[PDB]
Symmetry: D2
Subunit: 237 residues, 4 copies
Amino acid sequence: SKLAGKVAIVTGASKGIGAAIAKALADEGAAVVVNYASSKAGADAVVSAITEAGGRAVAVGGDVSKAADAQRIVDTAIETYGRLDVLVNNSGVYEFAPIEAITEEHYRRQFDTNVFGVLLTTQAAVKHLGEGASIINISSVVTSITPPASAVYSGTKGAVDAITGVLALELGPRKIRVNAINPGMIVTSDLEAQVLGQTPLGRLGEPNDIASVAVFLASDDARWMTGEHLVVSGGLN
Amino acid sequence: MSKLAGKVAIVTGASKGIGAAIAKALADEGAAVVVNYASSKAGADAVVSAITEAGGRAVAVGGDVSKAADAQRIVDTAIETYGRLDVLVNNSGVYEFAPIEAITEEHYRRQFDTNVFGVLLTTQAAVKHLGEGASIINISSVVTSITPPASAVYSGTKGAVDAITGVLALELGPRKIRVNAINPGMIVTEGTHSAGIIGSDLEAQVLGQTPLGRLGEPNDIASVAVFLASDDARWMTGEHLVVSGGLN
Amino acid sequence: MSKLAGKVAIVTGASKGIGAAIAKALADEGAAVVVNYASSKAGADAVVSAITEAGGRAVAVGGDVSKAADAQRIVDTAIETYGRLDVLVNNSGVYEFAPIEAITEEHYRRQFDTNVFGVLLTTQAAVKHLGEGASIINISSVVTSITPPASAVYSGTKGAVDAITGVLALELGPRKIRVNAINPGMIVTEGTHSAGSDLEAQVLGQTPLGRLGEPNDIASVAVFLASDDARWMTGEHLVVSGGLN
Amino acid sequence: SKLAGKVAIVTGASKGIGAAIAKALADEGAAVVVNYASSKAGADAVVSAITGGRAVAVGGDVSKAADAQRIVDTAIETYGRLDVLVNNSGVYEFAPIEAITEEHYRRQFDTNVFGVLLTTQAAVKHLGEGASIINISSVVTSITPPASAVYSGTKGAVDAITGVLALELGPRKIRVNAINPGMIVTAGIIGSDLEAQVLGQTPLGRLGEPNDIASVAVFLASDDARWMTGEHLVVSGGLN
Ligand code: NA
Ligand code: NA
Ligand code: NA
Ligand code: NA
Ligand code: NA
Ligand code: NA
Ligand code: NA
Ligand code: NA
C-alpha cells in the first residue's frame, strides 16, 4: 500500500471531494483525520467506512479559518496517531457575484476560509512535517478559465495557486512537497449542460476523479513533483 | 496626437514609486489624473505639481481603497473634477514577507484588504462610469510567476489579482471594457542603474537572475501602463504582462 | 517624437495581412522598413508605396526565409540600404489544418520549415547586426493557449516559436537584445467589423470583446514591443485575441 | 494491478527514462513493446528484467513513417491490442543561435516532433475509450535555457501537440498528456558543472533519476488519471 504507516488530515471532508479523498487515502493505508465544518454525520460515516474496511480514522469538528481550530485539527493527528505525513487542504466554500454585487462579507468569508484557512492549517501542520511529507491544496480550474461573476472565488483560488508555488520553494530544502489540484465542476441545470459541452472527455466530474489524483500526489509516486497545479476537469482549461 | 487626449484616469497608491510614475506618464499622453494616496499627501502633491508644471492636469485625493466610502470618493473625484472616467490603474498595494511559521492574522488581513479588496471596491465604484474603450489596469507582481520563499501572503494577494483580472476581462468584455494586469519585477529607486548601485543582497540575487542586466525602475512600468491604457492595446484583455527585464 | 526615429526594421512576410500592417505601423513611428515577401511582389510594392507616400522609408525584398541564403540577403538588404538594423519582426508563416489521421510529411515539413526554421535562420542572420536596445518580435498564435482540434502541426510550430522566444530572451539578454512574441487570435480582412463563415461566427461568439481581430490590432502591439516603451519586457508572449485564451 | 490486460508501447526505451517507464508499466500488468533506436542489448536487457511480465523488443526510428507503423503493428500482432502510448524517443543537441545549422534543426525536429506525430498517427487506429497517450516533453518549455533554441523548440511543439490532441481525441475518450522532466541523471567537466548548477536550482535538493519520471507515467497511463487530459506535468524536483 502506497501510504502504509502514514497519517493524513483532510479538511472539509464530511461530503463530496473531501470525503472521497479521505477514503482513497485510507485505501492506500493512511490513517485519516476527517475534519468537518458542517455535517458531523457525514464525517462519522466516512470514519465508519474507513474503519469497517480495516483502516484507522477519526472525525474532528472545526473551522479552519480559526487559528485555534486549525491547531486542534493538527493536534488530533499527533495525539491520536503520533505522526503526520499528508495534509489535504480541501476546506473551501464558494459564492458567485458580479462586480456590482460584491459585498465585504462575500469577500471576507471566502478569503478567510479558502485562503487564511489553508495558511493556518498548513502553519500548524508544518511543525510536524518532515522529509517525504506531502501537502495537497484543493484549488479549482477557475484559475485557468476565470468565469464571469467569480472574481472573489477565483481570487481565492488564484491565491491558493500562488501559495502552493511559494511553499514548494520555501519547504523544498525540508523535502516537503506542496502541490495543487485544480478540479473542474464535480457533481455529488443550465450550468451543468454548459460545462458538459465544454468538457472534452464527455461527462461531468465525480469526487473520485479528484480522489485518485490526491492519492498519487500524496504517495512517493509524486516524489519528484512540487509546486505543480494539476487541472482535473476532463480537459477543460 | 496624444494617446490619451481628452481622457481621465485614476491611479491608486500614486504618491511614490510605480504609481507616481504611472500618473506622470498617463498625463504626458494627455490624460487628466486623479492621484490617490493612502497617507503621503506630500508625495501626491509633488506628483501633481510635477504633472501641472509639465502642462498636464491632476488632483490629489487621500483615501483607503479598502474602505468602500473612500473607494467611492476617489471615483467621485474623477467625475467631479473632470466630468468622466476612462482609465483605472489599481496600484495601491502593500507588501510584507514572512515564512509560514511567522504568518499572523494581521499580516494576512492587511495585505489582502488592500491588495485584493481595495482592487475590487475601487473597480466596483469605477465601472458605473466606464464605457466602451475603457481600460482597467491591475498592478500585480512577477511573484505570481516566481513565487519566492517567505512570500505566501504577498504572492497570494497577487495570484488573486491575476485571477480577478481574468474574471473581469470576461465579465466586462461585452461592455468593451478591457482589463489587464502588469506584473512588475523588483523595482528600485529611479537613478539607481545610472549611479551604479547594487543596494542589498536581495537586489544582487534578483539582478543575477535578470537577463537584461539591471533592476527595473518606475518608468519601466509606467510606459507599459500607458500602452495598456491606450487604444494601442485595444485587442488585449485578460493579459498579465511580466515587466521584470526577463525574470520569470 | 517618433518612437522609432532613425531605427531600421525588417518585417518578414509583409506583402499582406498582419505583416503589411506591422510594416506600415513601424514606419509611421519613423522606422525605415525592409519589406520582405515570399511570393507577392505587388503586395510588397504597394506596402512600400504606402510608406513612402506617407513620408517614411521602405524597400521590398523577395525571399524565402526557410532558405539560409535568402534569410541572409534579407538582412543584408537592411544593412546595405540603411546602414543598421534594430528591429526584427518574424511574421512569415503559413498554416494548414488537418486531423492526426490526415497528417502528411509535406504538411509537417512545409509548416515547420517556414514557421520555425525560417524564424531561426532570419534571427541568426540578424543577430550579427543587433546591439543594445534591439528588439526581436516573433509572430506566434493564440493556438498555443487554445490548441484547437485538427491543428497539431500548426500549433506545434507556434509552440516551438513560443519556446524559442523564451530561450532567445535569456540567451541574448546579456547583450540587451529583447525577444518577445505576439500571439494573435484569428485575424480577418481589414474592414470586416465595420461591414458587418461558420468558423468565424464560432470564434466571434468566444471572443469577449465582440468582434474579430484585424491586422492593425496586431500592428499596434508590434510597435509597442519594438519601442523603448517595452524596454523592461523580454521573453513575453502577448495574446492579442480580444480576450480569447 | 493498474494496467492488467493492457498493452503499452514505449519509444526510445533502451536506456534512461524510457527503460524505467517500460519496467514500471509492466510492473502494473501491462505488456510492453520496448522500442529502441539502436541499443538492442539495452532493450533486450529491459525485456529480460520484465520477464514477472510480458515484453518484446523492437528496433526502429520513429522519424521514419514505416518504422513507426511497424512499432505499432508489433503491439497488435504480439498482444492483440493497444492501450498506452509513451512517446519518449528523443535526441537532444544544444547550440547558441549563431551555431544553429539545418542538420541540427532537422535531426531534432524529425525525431522529437515528427516521430511523435507518426507514432501517434499509427497508434490511434487501435485506441479506444480509456486509452492514454503520454508525451515525454521537458522542463525546458518552462525554463527555456540559453543555447537550447532547437531542443526547447521541439519540446514546445510537443506541449502544443499534446493540447491539440487532448481536444481532438476527447470525443473518443482517449487521454493525451505530457510529462516535462527536469534533468535526469542516467560528460566530463561539462556534465559535472551542469549537474551542480541544476542541483542548486532544484528545490527538493537532489538530481532526478529515471524512476522519478517512470512513476508519473504509470499514473498517467492508469485510470487514476481518468479525469486529466491536455495537462503537462513538470517533474523536476520543483524547478520551473
Ligand atoms: Na483563461
Ligand atoms: Na482549453
Ligand atoms: Na514558477
Ligand atoms: Na525563467
Ligand atoms: Na488551453
Ligand atoms: Na479563457
Ligand atoms: Na520561463
Ligand atoms: Na520557479
